[PDB]
């Protein structure tokens with residue numbers, strides 16, 4: 531039915547804050563009510579400029595705990611993304627403010643802004659996704675191109691590698707599920723052989 535008053539009033543206040551913010555007027559962040567009692571929200575953030583994510587928009591599932599504001603929201607990327615601190619499979623996020631560094635003065639606005647800042651500054655030595663973190667460290671340029679490909683396919687960003695696109699359409703035309711294909715190629719250094727071998731393992 532209803533959450534505790536302190537939680538209700540905090541979410542209402544923070545929701546209004548996002549609605550009125552310069553950041554939402556500049557189309558950088560937003561929040562949408564999913565549930566009338568404020569326990570679930572949907573966020574969106576713009577990819578930051580001069581990153582592989584630029585031009586993309588990333589949707590977020592936000593669940594507000596009963597203990598709000600003393601524990602963080604649970605946040606997950608709905609939009610698929612290629613980033614060392616986010617699971618390429620589940621959208622689970624590795625960020626201290628969602629874990630052990632939450633403070634009660636933090637808000638929906640500052641969480642959304644911190645997630646955009648995380649896109650612009652990955653921490654690969656404390657990763658959520660080992661495969662992506664390894665690629666980020668061992669082959670920066672391949673990482674950038676892969677992240678940009680995912681931004682284009684999943685988040686609506688304008689550009690991506692023609693090479694990569696051709697490999698994807700090749701495997702999709704061969705009868706494999708497109709998401710499976712993207713994942714396989716992205717995880718196997720874009721090598722059609724090892725990616726195909728992985729796809730046949732299923």
Ligand SMILES: [Ca+2]
Nearest residue numbers: 531532533534
């Ligand atoms: Ca209740």
